Coordinates of C-alpha atoms and ligand atoms in Angstrom, one line a residue:
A871 CA 62.6 -34.3 -146.5
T872 CA 61.9 -37.2 -144.2
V873 CA 59.6 -37.8 -141.3
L874 CA 60.7 -38.3 -137.7
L875 CA 61.9 -41.9 -136.9
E876 CA 58.9 -44.1 -136.2
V877 CA 58.7 -46.9 -133.5
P878 CA 58.5 -49.8 -133.4
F879 CA 61.2 -50.7 -135.9
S880 CA 60.1 -54.3 -136.8
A881 CA 57.7 -56.9 -135.5
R882 CA 60.2 -59.7 -136.3
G883 CA 61.4 -61.4 -133.1
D884 CA 64.1 -63.6 -134.6
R885 CA 66.7 -60.8 -135.4
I886 CA 67.5 -57.4 -133.9
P887 CA 67.5 -54.5 -136.4
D888 CA 70.9 -52.9 -137.2
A889 CA 69.3 -49.6 -136.3
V890 CA 69.3 -50.4 -132.6
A891 CA 73.2 -50.5 -132.4
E892 CA 73.4 -47.4 -134.6
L893 CA 71.1 -45.5 -132.2
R894 CA 72.8 -46.9 -129.2
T895 CA 76.3 -45.7 -130.4
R896 CA 75.3 -42.4 -131.9
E897 CA 72.1 -41.2 -130.1
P898 CA 71.3 -43.5 -127.1
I899 CA 68.4 -41.1 -126.3
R900 CA 66.6 -39.6 -129.3
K901 CA 63.2 -38.4 -130.4
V902 CA 60.8 -40.8 -132.2
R903 CA 57.1 -40.9 -133.2
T904 CA 54.8 -43.5 -131.8
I905 CA 51.9 -45.2 -133.6
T906 CA 49.5 -42.6 -132.0
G907 CA 51.5 -39.7 -133.6
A908 CA 52.9 -38.6 -130.2
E909 CA 56.6 -37.8 -129.9
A910 CA 58.7 -39.7 -127.3
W911 CA 62.3 -40.2 -126.2
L912 CA 63.6 -43.6 -127.2
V913 CA 66.4 -44.8 -124.7
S914 CA 68.6 -47.6 -126.0
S915 CA 71.8 -48.0 -123.9
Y916 CA 72.1 -50.1 -120.8
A917 CA 73.3 -47.1 -118.8
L918 CA 70.4 -44.8 -119.8
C919 CA 67.7 -47.6 -119.6
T920 CA 68.8 -48.3 -116.1
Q921 CA 68.8 -44.7 -115.1
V922 CA 65.2 -44.2 -116.3
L923 CA 63.9 -47.4 -114.8
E924 CA 65.5 -46.6 -111.4
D925 CA 64.2 -43.0 -111.1
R926 CA 60.5 -43.0 -110.1
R927 CA 60.1 -39.4 -111.4
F928 CA 59.8 -41.3 -114.7
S929 CA 56.4 -42.5 -113.7
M930 CA 54.5 -45.6 -115.0
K931 CA 51.2 -44.5 -113.5
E932 CA 51.3 -41.0 -115.0
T933 CA 51.3 -42.5 -118.5
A934 CA 47.6 -43.0 -118.0
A935 CA 46.8 -39.3 -117.5
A936 CA 44.3 -37.7 -119.9
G937 CA 46.1 -35.6 -122.5
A938 CA 49.6 -37.3 -122.1
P939 CA 51.6 -38.2 -125.2
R940 CA 50.8 -42.0 -125.6
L941 CA 52.7 -45.0 -126.8
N942 CA 49.4 -46.7 -127.6
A943 CA 45.8 -46.7 -126.5
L944 CA 44.8 -48.1 -123.1
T945 CA 43.2 -51.5 -123.2
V946 CA 42.4 -51.4 -119.5
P947 CA 40.7 -48.8 -117.3
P948 CA 43.2 -46.0 -116.5
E949 CA 43.5 -46.7 -112.8
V950 CA 44.6 -50.3 -113.7
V951 CA 47.8 -49.0 -115.2
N952 CA 48.8 -48.5 -111.5
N953 CA 47.8 -52.1 -110.8
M954 CA 50.7 -53.1 -108.6
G955 CA 50.5 -49.8 -106.7
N956 CA 46.9 -50.4 -106.1
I957 CA 47.6 -53.9 -104.8
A958 CA 50.4 -52.6 -102.5
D959 CA 48.1 -49.8 -101.2
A960 CA 45.4 -52.5 -100.3
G961 CA 47.9 -54.4 -98.2
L962 CA 48.0 -57.3 -100.7
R963 CA 51.5 -57.2 -102.1
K964 CA 53.1 -59.8 -100.0
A965 CA 50.2 -62.3 -100.4
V966 CA 50.0 -61.8 -104.2
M967 CA 53.8 -62.2 -104.5
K968 CA 53.7 -65.3 -102.4
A969 CA 51.0 -67.0 -104.4
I970 CA 52.9 -66.5 -107.8
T971 CA 56.2 -68.1 -106.8
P972 CA 56.9 -71.5 -108.4
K973 CA 57.4 -72.9 -104.9
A974 CA 54.0 -74.3 -104.2
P975 CA 54.2 -78.1 -103.5
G976 CA 53.4 -80.1 -106.7
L977 CA 53.6 -77.0 -109.0
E978 CA 56.7 -78.0 -110.8
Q979 CA 55.6 -81.6 -111.1
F980 CA 52.3 -80.3 -112.6
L981 CA 54.3 -78.2 -115.2
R982 CA 56.4 -81.2 -116.1
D983 CA 53.4 -83.5 -116.5
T984 CA 51.5 -80.9 -118.5
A985 CA 54.5 -80.3 -120.8
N986 CA 55.0 -84.1 -121.3
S987 CA 51.4 -84.6 -122.1
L988 CA 51.3 -81.8 -124.7
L989 CA 54.5 -83.1 -126.3
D990 CA 53.2 -86.8 -126.3
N991 CA 50.1 -85.5 -128.1
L992 CA 52.2 -83.8 -130.8
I993 CA 54.4 -86.9 -131.3
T994 CA 51.2 -89.1 -131.7
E995 CA 49.8 -86.8 -134.2
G996 CA 53.1 -86.6 -136.2
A997 CA 55.1 -83.7 -137.6
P998 CA 54.8 -80.9 -138.3
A999 CA 53.7 -79.6 -134.8
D1000 CA 52.9 -75.9 -133.9
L1001 CA 55.0 -75.3 -130.8
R1002 CA 53.2 -71.9 -130.1
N1003 CA 49.5 -72.9 -130.3
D1004 CA 50.0 -76.6 -129.3
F1005 CA 52.8 -76.3 -126.7
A1006 CA 54.0 -73.0 -125.3
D1007 CA 50.7 -71.2 -125.0
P1008 CA 48.7 -74.1 -123.6
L1009 CA 51.5 -74.8 -121.1
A1010 CA 51.4 -71.1 -120.0
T1011 CA 47.6 -71.2 -119.8
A1012 CA 47.6 -74.4 -117.7
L1013 CA 50.2 -73.0 -115.4
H1014 CA 48.2 -69.9 -114.8
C1015 CA 45.0 -71.7 -114.1
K1016 CA 46.8 -73.8 -111.5
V1017 CA 48.6 -70.7 -110.0
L1018 CA 45.3 -68.9 -109.8
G1019 CA 43.3 -71.9 -108.5
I1020 CA 40.7 -71.8 -111.3
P1021 CA 39.4 -74.7 -113.4
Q1022 CA 41.8 -75.8 -116.2
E1023 CA 38.8 -76.0 -118.5
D1024 CA 38.2 -72.2 -118.1
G1025 CA 41.7 -71.5 -119.4
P1026 CA 41.0 -71.5 -123.2
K1027 CA 38.2 -68.9 -123.1
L1028 CA 40.3 -66.6 -120.9
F1029 CA 43.2 -67.1 -123.2
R1030 CA 41.3 -66.1 -126.3
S1031 CA 40.9 -62.5 -124.9
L1032 CA 44.6 -62.1 -125.1
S1033 CA 45.1 -61.5 -128.9
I1034 CA 43.1 -58.3 -128.4
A1035 CA 43.9 -57.4 -124.7
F1036 CA 47.6 -57.1 -125.5
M1037 CA 47.2 -55.1 -128.7
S1038 CA 49.4 -52.1 -129.2
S1039 CA 46.9 -49.8 -131.1
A1040 CA 46.7 -46.2 -132.1
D1041 CA 43.1 -46.1 -131.0
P1042 CA 40.8 -47.6 -128.3
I1043 CA 39.7 -51.1 -129.1
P1044 CA 36.0 -51.9 -128.6
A1045 CA 36.5 -55.7 -128.2
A1046 CA 39.1 -55.0 -125.4
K1047 CA 36.4 -53.5 -123.2
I1048 CA 33.9 -56.3 -124.1
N1049 CA 36.4 -59.0 -123.1
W1050 CA 37.6 -57.0 -120.0
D1051 CA 34.1 -56.7 -118.6
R1052 CA 33.3 -60.3 -119.3
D1053 CA 36.6 -61.5 -117.7
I1054 CA 36.1 -59.3 -114.6
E1055 CA 32.6 -60.8 -114.2
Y1056 CA 34.2 -64.3 -114.3
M1057 CA 36.8 -63.4 -111.7
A1058 CA 34.1 -61.8 -109.5
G1059 CA 32.2 -65.1 -109.7
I1060 CA 35.3 -67.0 -108.8
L1061 CA 35.6 -65.0 -105.6
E1062 CA 32.1 -66.1 -104.7
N1063 CA 32.6 -69.8 -105.7
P1064 CA 33.2 -72.1 -102.7
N1065 CA 35.2 -74.5 -104.8
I1066 CA 38.0 -72.0 -105.2
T1067 CA 40.2 -72.6 -102.2
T1068 CA 43.7 -72.8 -103.7
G1069 CA 46.1 -70.6 -105.6
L1070 CA 46.0 -66.8 -105.9
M1071 CA 42.2 -66.6 -106.2
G1072 CA 41.6 -69.0 -103.2
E1073 CA 43.9 -66.7 -101.1
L1074 CA 42.2 -63.5 -102.3
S1075 CA 38.9 -65.1 -101.6
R1076 CA 39.8 -65.7 -98.0
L1077 CA 41.4 -62.3 -97.5
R1078 CA 38.3 -60.6 -98.9
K1079 CA 36.3 -62.0 -95.9
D1080 CA 39.0 -61.1 -93.4
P1081 CA 38.3 -57.9 -91.3
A1082 CA 41.7 -56.4 -92.1
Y1083 CA 40.6 -56.2 -95.9
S1084 CA 36.9 -55.3 -95.5
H1085 CA 37.3 -52.0 -97.3
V1086 CA 39.4 -53.4 -100.2
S1087 CA 37.1 -53.3 -103.2
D1088 CA 35.6 -56.3 -105.0
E1089 CA 36.7 -54.5 -108.2
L1090 CA 40.4 -54.7 -107.2
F1091 CA 40.1 -58.4 -106.2
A1092 CA 38.6 -59.3 -109.6
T1093 CA 41.1 -57.0 -111.4
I1094 CA 44.1 -58.9 -109.8
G1095 CA 42.8 -62.2 -111.3
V1096 CA 42.2 -60.8 -114.8
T1097 CA 45.5 -58.9 -115.0
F1098 CA 47.7 -61.6 -113.5
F1099 CA 46.2 -64.3 -115.7
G1100 CA 46.6 -62.1 -118.8
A1101 CA 50.0 -60.6 -118.2
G1102 CA 51.4 -63.9 -116.9
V1103 CA 50.1 -66.0 -119.8
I1104 CA 51.0 -63.6 -122.6
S1105 CA 54.5 -63.0 -121.1
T1106 CA 55.4 -66.7 -120.4
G1107 CA 53.8 -68.0 -123.6
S1108 CA 55.4 -65.4 -125.8
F1109 CA 58.9 -65.7 -124.1
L1110 CA 58.9 -69.5 -124.3
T1111 CA 57.9 -69.4 -128.0
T1112 CA 60.6 -67.0 -129.1
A1113 CA 63.2 -68.7 -126.8
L1114 CA 62.4 -72.0 -128.6
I1115 CA 63.2 -70.3 -132.0
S1116 CA 66.6 -69.1 -130.5
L1117 CA 67.3 -72.5 -129.3
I1118 CA 66.3 -74.3 -132.5
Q1119 CA 68.6 -72.0 -134.4
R1120 CA 71.5 -73.1 -132.2
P1121 CA 71.8 -76.9 -132.6
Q1122 CA 75.1 -76.9 -130.6
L1123 CA 73.3 -75.3 -127.6
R1124 CA 70.3 -77.5 -128.1
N1125 CA 72.5 -80.5 -127.9
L1126 CA 74.6 -79.1 -124.9
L1127 CA 71.3 -78.5 -122.9
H1128 CA 70.0 -82.0 -123.9
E1129 CA 73.3 -83.6 -122.7
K1130 CA 73.7 -81.4 -119.6
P1131 CA 70.2 -80.3 -118.4
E1132 CA 71.7 -78.8 -115.3
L1133 CA 72.8 -76.0 -117.7
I1134 CA 69.1 -75.2 -118.6
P1135 CA 68.8 -72.4 -116.0
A1136 CA 71.9 -70.6 -117.3
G1137 CA 70.6 -71.2 -120.9
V1138 CA 67.2 -69.7 -120.0
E1139 CA 68.8 -66.7 -118.5
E1140 CA 70.8 -66.0 -121.7
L1141 CA 67.5 -66.7 -123.7
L1142 CA 65.9 -64.0 -121.5
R1143 CA 68.7 -61.6 -122.2
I1144 CA 68.5 -61.9 -125.9
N1145 CA 64.7 -62.1 -126.1
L1146 CA 62.9 -59.8 -128.4
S1147 CA 59.4 -60.6 -127.1
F1148 CA 58.6 -57.0 -125.9
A1149 CA 57.5 -55.2 -129.1
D1150 CA 57.7 -51.6 -127.6
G1151 CA 59.9 -49.8 -125.1
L1152 CA 58.5 -49.7 -121.6
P1153 CA 56.7 -46.3 -121.3
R1154 CA 57.2 -43.7 -118.6
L1155 CA 56.0 -40.1 -118.2
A1156 CA 58.5 -37.6 -116.8
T1157 CA 57.1 -35.8 -113.7
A1158 CA 60.1 -33.3 -113.6
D1159 CA 62.8 -31.9 -115.9
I1160 CA 65.5 -34.6 -115.8
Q1161 CA 68.8 -34.8 -117.7
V1162 CA 69.3 -38.2 -119.5
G1163 CA 72.5 -38.3 -121.5
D1164 CA 72.7 -35.3 -123.8
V1165 CA 68.9 -34.6 -123.5
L1166 CA 67.0 -32.6 -120.9
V1167 CA 63.6 -34.5 -120.8
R1168 CA 60.9 -32.1 -119.8
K1169 CA 58.1 -32.7 -117.5
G1170 CA 55.1 -34.3 -119.3
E1171 CA 57.2 -36.0 -122.0
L1172 CA 57.0 -39.7 -122.8
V1173 CA 60.1 -41.9 -122.5
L1174 CA 60.4 -45.4 -123.9
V1175 CA 62.9 -47.8 -122.4
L1176 CA 64.0 -50.2 -125.2
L1177 CA 64.8 -53.5 -123.4
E1178 CA 66.8 -54.9 -126.3
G1179 CA 68.8 -51.7 -126.5
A1180 CA 70.0 -52.4 -122.9
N1181 CA 70.3 -56.2 -123.3
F1182 CA 72.4 -56.1 -126.5
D1183 CA 74.6 -53.3 -125.3
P1184 CA 78.2 -54.6 -125.9
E1185 CA 79.5 -52.2 -123.1
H1186 CA 77.6 -54.4 -120.6
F1187 CA 77.3 -57.7 -122.4
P1188 CA 80.3 -58.3 -124.7
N1189 CA 79.5 -60.3 -127.8
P1190 CA 75.8 -59.5 -127.1
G1191 CA 74.3 -61.6 -129.9
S1192 CA 76.0 -64.8 -128.6
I1193 CA 74.5 -67.0 -125.9
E1194 CA 77.4 -67.6 -123.4
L1195 CA 76.6 -69.7 -120.4
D1196 CA 79.6 -68.4 -118.4
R1197 CA 79.0 -64.7 -118.2
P1198 CA 79.9 -63.0 -114.9
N1199 CA 76.8 -60.8 -114.9
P1200 CA 74.1 -63.2 -116.2
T1201 CA 71.0 -61.9 -114.4
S1202 CA 71.8 -58.2 -114.8
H1203 CA 69.7 -58.0 -118.0
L1204 CA 66.5 -56.0 -118.1
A1205 CA 64.1 -58.7 -119.4
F1206 CA 62.1 -58.4 -116.2
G1207 CA 62.5 -54.6 -116.0
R1208 CA 64.3 -52.9 -113.1
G1209 CA 63.4 -50.8 -110.1
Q1210 CA 60.0 -50.1 -108.7
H1211 CA 58.1 -52.1 -111.3
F1212 CA 60.5 -55.1 -111.6
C1213 CA 58.3 -58.2 -112.6
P1214 CA 56.9 -60.0 -109.6
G1215 CA 56.5 -63.1 -111.8
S1216 CA 60.1 -63.4 -112.6
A1217 CA 60.7 -66.7 -110.8
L1218 CA 57.6 -68.2 -112.2
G1219 CA 58.5 -67.2 -115.7
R1220 CA 62.0 -68.6 -115.4
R1221 CA 60.6 -71.9 -114.1
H1222 CA 57.9 -72.2 -116.9
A1223 CA 60.6 -71.8 -119.5
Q1224 CA 63.2 -74.1 -117.9
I1225 CA 60.6 -76.9 -117.5
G1226 CA 59.1 -76.4 -121.0
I1227 CA 62.6 -76.6 -122.5
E1228 CA 63.7 -79.6 -120.4
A1229 CA 60.6 -81.5 -121.4
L1230 CA 60.9 -80.6 -125.1
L1231 CA 64.5 -81.6 -125.4
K1232 CA 64.0 -84.9 -123.7
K1233 CA 60.9 -85.7 -126.0
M1234 CA 62.2 -84.1 -129.2
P1235 CA 65.9 -84.0 -129.1
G1236 CA 66.1 -83.5 -132.9
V1237 CA 63.6 -80.5 -132.9
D1238 CA 64.1 -78.3 -135.9
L1239 CA 62.0 -75.7 -137.8
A1240 CA 59.8 -77.4 -140.5
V1241 CA 59.7 -74.2 -142.6
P1242 CA 62.4 -71.7 -143.6
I1243 CA 62.7 -69.1 -140.8
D1244 CA 61.6 -66.3 -143.0
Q1245 CA 58.2 -68.0 -143.4
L1246 CA 57.2 -67.3 -139.8
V1247 CA 54.4 -64.8 -139.6
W1248 CA 55.1 -62.1 -137.0
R1249 CA 52.1 -60.6 -135.2
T1250 CA 51.9 -56.8 -135.8
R1251 CA 50.6 -53.9 -133.6
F1252 CA 50.9 -56.1 -130.5
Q1253 CA 52.7 -55.6 -127.2
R1254 CA 54.7 -58.8 -127.9
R1255 CA 56.6 -60.1 -130.9
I1256 CA 55.4 -63.7 -131.6
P1257 CA 55.0 -65.9 -134.6
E1258 CA 51.4 -66.8 -135.4
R1259 CA 52.5 -70.5 -135.8
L1260 CA 55.8 -72.1 -135.0
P1261 CA 56.0 -75.3 -137.2
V1262 CA 58.6 -77.8 -136.2
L1263 CA 59.6 -81.4 -136.9
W1264 CA 61.9 -83.7 -134.9
Ligands
HEM2768 C1 59.1 -64.7 -119.0 C2 58.0 -64.1 -118.5 C3 57.9 -62.6 -118.1 C4 58.6 -61.5 -118.6 C5 59.6 -61.5 -119.6 C6 58.0 -60.4 -117.9 C7 58.4 -59.1 -118.0 C8 58.0 -58.0 -117.3 C9 58.6 -56.7 -117.4 C10 59.6 -56.2 -118.4 C11 57.9 -55.9 -116.5 C12 58.2 -54.5 -116.1 C13 57.2 -53.5 -116.8 C14 57.6 -52.1 -116.6 O1 58.4 -51.7 -115.8 O2 56.9 -51.2 -117.3 C15 57.0 -56.8 -115.8 C16 56.1 -56.3 -114.8 C17 55.0 -57.1 -114.3 N1 54.9 -58.5 -114.5 FE1 56.0 -59.6 -115.7 N2 57.0 -60.8 -117.0 C18 56.9 -62.2 -117.2 C19 56.1 -63.0 -116.4 C20 55.2 -62.6 -115.5 C21 54.2 -63.4 -114.7 C22 54.3 -64.9 -114.7 C23 53.4 -62.6 -114.1 C24 52.2 -63.0 -113.2 C25 51.7 -64.2 -113.0 C26 53.8 -61.3 -114.3 C27 53.2 -60.1 -113.8 C28 53.7 -58.8 -113.9 C29 53.2 -57.6 -113.1 C30 52.0 -57.7 -112.2 C31 54.0 -56.6 -113.4 C32 54.0 -55.1 -112.9 C33 54.8 -54.9 -111.7 C34 54.8 -53.4 -111.1 O3 54.3 -52.6 -111.8 O4 55.4 -53.3 -110.1 N3 54.9 -61.2 -115.2 N4 57.0 -58.1 -116.3
TZM2769 N1 36.3 -49.8 -119.2 C1 37.3 -50.2 -120.1 C2 37.8 -51.5 -120.0 C3 38.8 -51.8 -120.9 C4 39.3 -50.9 -121.9 C5 38.8 -49.6 -121.9 C6 39.2 -48.6 -122.9 N2 38.4 -48.7 -124.1 C7 37.3 -48.0 -124.3 N3 36.7 -48.4 -125.4 C8 37.5 -49.4 -125.9 N4 38.5 -49.6 -125.0 C9 37.7 -49.2 -121.0
TZM2770 N1 54.4 -59.2 -117.2 C1 54.2 -57.8 -117.5 C2 55.1 -57.2 -118.4 C3 54.9 -55.8 -118.7 C4 53.9 -55.1 -118.0 C5 53.1 -55.7 -117.1 C6 52.2 -54.8 -116.4 N2 51.1 -55.4 -115.6 C7 50.7 -55.1 -114.3 N3 49.6 -55.8 -114.1 C8 49.5 -56.6 -115.2 N4 50.3 -56.2 -116.2 C9 53.3 -57.1 -116.8

């Protein structure tokens, strides 16, 4: 006898497991067991991933209900799982979305200058350099302090919550509450701090005193700062780190982008498509009985949308493991989700990666791994796949 197939399959973010293509061909929706012991439906084709993400009866907010089958334990309060819904209900969606575009005057120049400074520091110090801890993550942290309007020197302490806040655990995590309550207290103080007049927190601070928002809670305003910092920094830092591995493993591409930097946006879009940064499928709870493929999903069941299942589906993306800059459907991947919950940071995340890559390739055109790739240490039981260190030379 064997036990029911367990998820996730592997924490390694440098290769896709052969099980994904076997599932997708043979059983593109099938039952699995999560780390909590709950059963769930794992969906792994482009067609069925899109179906689930476009039908709101597969609900994100209902995954927080008491007694539901769970992918992992909550690391935030349960109402926060409906964060963007709560922001829309408070009349804040347009303003939040506006503050996190990469379009603010000076923002791109600030990203380039920050990237170049970080890279000059590594060159001065000499190889090997850790491109996660000393490049991608500080670049994401600096970006988010600037986008929020908060001091750059507060970024490192906020960032050190993230190795716990984004855990994917079978059980509640006591440190996640300690850090959440401290970070909410910090963001509440930011809303009271007259120096904070720019970025997302400067805008929320003004709207908070405007009569049209007088009954929006201070808790929601503070929660927007904590959740957008955390989700944006973990998502951009982890994506850029694993994208740099994919790039370094393709010297030909590396060299093409270095020669013809105008191709960096197309290269980043393919790097998004093939990215393994999400460690788990996106969870949803069925609110009705719904046919998905050969399975009737029942009300109350958990469904997990496997992004690499969609993004490596050869019926949508022929030769899915190859980066091809001339695809006719280049942005149709699911790296930013799809439907109601499509990522509102998508433009920002694209620009962080494009600028980080352009700066790296101009400063370190000969970048290469400084250790055999199998020697990277992949973080486990986490919502992202990331190497603990990314040692390079040039
Ligand atoms: C390369 C970087 C990023 C990737 C790959 C990414 C990916 C995603 C994905 C897959 C979702 C959908 C989740 C779901 O449907 O269950 C999402 C939603 C979200 N993302 Fe991102 N993200 C990135 C950057 C950012 C940034 C920069 C921010 C904010 C500063 C951000 C904030 C959010 C929020 C608030 C949601 C929830 C939206 C909703 O529920 O309507 N993300 N992101
Ligand atoms: N209030 C709060 C904030 C963040 C996370 C949680 C869930 N949890 C409860 N104990 C450990 N984690 C509860
Ligand atoms: N960037 C990202 C990816 C997956 C899930 C989320 C959810 N979120 C909503 N508010 C903060 N985080 C955000």
